[PDB]
Symmetry: C2
Subunit: 93 residues, 2 copies
């Protein structure tokens, strides 16, 4: 299994639009072959730091989803609502 | 009301994986019946093999805090502390 950490920074007042951006992504991964779970989280220490994390049957299932059409209006709102974006892949042990 | 997701991002030096995997099991034992503890997961970076992730989910931040603020708990990150060269503990509230 693959666990993705998508770590971002959201600027003041950006919660509403960032959450909407997450929900639109969530819509498309709920239907994705091999999607196991995903969550949107906010740091309890620095409220600017947020996490989108998901779990997949394999890295190949994630890549299939990422390589699907329509992500133009999925990535654009993420860029517009975040000031920093880090992607970290992990294998579940 | 919102669940808490903890990210424990650690680095394990060459030769240390076996003792680290033992430490992960010997913290699962200590939270196995902790009020509000939901689940734990162990992950390893597929980019840098030295980077590992322990992630845990709790019913609420207050549940996790009551388990942490109790006295016999700092003798427990210590096996993780004693098997890793650096550590970063990041707690998150689950928003959706």
């Amino acid at each position: 299994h693959l666990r993705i950490l998508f770590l971002v920074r959201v600027e003041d007042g950006g919660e509403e639009d960032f959450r909407t951006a997450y929900e639109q992504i969530r819509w498309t991964v709920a239907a994705a072959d091999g999607h196991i779970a995903d969550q949107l989280c906010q740091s309890t220490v620095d409220p600017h730091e947020w996490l989108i994390t998901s779990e997949w049957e394999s890295a190949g299932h994630y890549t299939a989803w990422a390589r699907h059409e329509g992500h133009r209006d999925l990535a654009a709102p993420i860029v517009a609502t975040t000031s920093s974006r880090i992607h970290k892949p992990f294998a579940v042990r």
